[PDB]
Design a protein around this ligand. Structure first.
Ligand SMILES: CN(C(=O)c1cc2c(C(=O)N3CCCC3)[nH]nc2cc1O)c1ccc(N2CCOCC2)cc1
Ligand SMILES: CN(C(=O)c1cc2c(C(=O)N3CCCC3)[nH]nc2cc1O)c1ccc(N2CCOCC2)cc1
Lengths: 209, 209
């Protein structure tokens, strides 16, 4: 039912560095996640040019930002290409290996944590603000999956029996208690305007009722 | 034999802006092209994880920089995924439309030409230094092609009967007379160190004999 995996050694080391380093410029996590969503959307958009049937699972290409004060969660939803079971368990970790090692070498040489995206491992900056990250994903060629990690060197992958999402990725950030500023509408708008002004897909902020 | 196509209106406008604007920070073209090569290499590397036969056309994943003082050309060769005929004629132009329009709107609003890559149209910065650009490409699923443009609103595409390259893309920059500094070893090294220090593939500079 639920399978548990160890992160690649380099990724586990990067996650501990992120979780334990005193670093006040935490807002970069949102830019990194939106950039990842933009990449997934670019991929499905490109693939649909030669195979329009790839859009049968949904034609709208967008990003939704969903803060939830009551649950203390910030959700980033996109209708990109999504990820396969192989992506979640191995492919993405394999690809991230050289960038993770290079990033850690750069930090040692005095680089700033904000440079994380230049190494293709921006996702892990989510651990600056989140105690747990849950990722629900659906690729055309595979089942709907739930990936999850509270760091500590492991992650889980299971088939997701929850609401179907058609195609794409939903990243659910379970925020740390001192990081609730990222649930504020004005704060999210400020971050998006500063870092993500130039993304080629509509970014919609869902206002809480 | 040789087919001639018009650039999409927005791209033709961007090219004229690039060719006609007084802008001294021309070195960004090399960073933009190396970033494009890195993207192509990421794609083949990722695809090879689920289908290792995609590497039958070549296992080495790298970038070569080849200045040629005698021909006044700077060649950037990569062994990435390469491009199909559809990529050259339509797909890449289609995708670049929103980014090109957005980039031009940003320039109007005072943005710097160096921001070109943030709009996914970095390739066109090649026209800061080149009077003509020739692109030889080979994707696993297609024939070897030669794309070429001296701007002026048109480009050509033909099947290439020249040396086979296995898989990848070769960008040949026919430099403007006042832009020969980009053929100098020290100058290329300076640019690569400043802008491309963090690329996940070997970048080899070929020294002229
Ligand atoms: C296909 N795909 C996605 O569906 C997707 C993944 C996301 C992640 C993420 O990175 N992970 C979530 C689980 C663990 C790793 N964060 N937000 C995401 C939004 C998405 O739509 C995807 C997009 C981008 C990238 N990367 C970009 C940087 O360079 C390396 C590849 C890899 C996959
Ligand atoms: C698959 N592929 C390539 O084989 C390749 C293309 C290159 C270009 C280029 O852009 N063009 C050459 C002909 C006309 C347009 N310049 N140097 C390149 C090196 C390459 O290996 C490729 C790589 C990157 C991208 N883009 C990145 C930015 O975002 C939009 C997509 C699109 C295709």
């Amino acid at each position: 039912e639920v399978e548990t995996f160890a992160f690649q050694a380099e990724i586990a080391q990067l996650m501990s560095l992120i979780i334990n380093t005193f670093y006040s410029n935490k807002e970069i996590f949102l830019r990194e996640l939106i950039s990842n969503s933009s990449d997934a959307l670019d991929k499905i958009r490109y693939e649909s040019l030669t195979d329009p049937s790839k859009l049968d699972s949904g034609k709208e290409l967008h990003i939704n930002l969903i803060p939830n004060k009551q649950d203390r969660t910030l959700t980033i939803v996109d209708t990109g290409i999504g990820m396969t079971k192989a992506d979640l368990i191995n492919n993405l970790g394999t690809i991230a290996k050289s960038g993770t090692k290079a990033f850690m070498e750069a930090l040692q040489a005095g680089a700033d944590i904000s440079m994380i995206g230049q190494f293709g491992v921006g996702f892990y900056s989510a651990y600056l603000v989140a105690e747990k990250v849950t990722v629900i994903t659906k690729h055309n060629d595979d089942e709907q999956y739930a990936w999850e990690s509270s760091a500590g060197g492991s992650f889980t992958v299971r088939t997701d029996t929850g609401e179907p999402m058609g195609r794409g990725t939903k990243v659910i950030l379970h925020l740390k208690e001192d990081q609730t500023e990222y649930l504020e509408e004005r704060r999210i708008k400020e971050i998006v305007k500063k870092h993500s002004q130039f993304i080629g897909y509509p970014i919609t902020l869902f206002v809480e009722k």
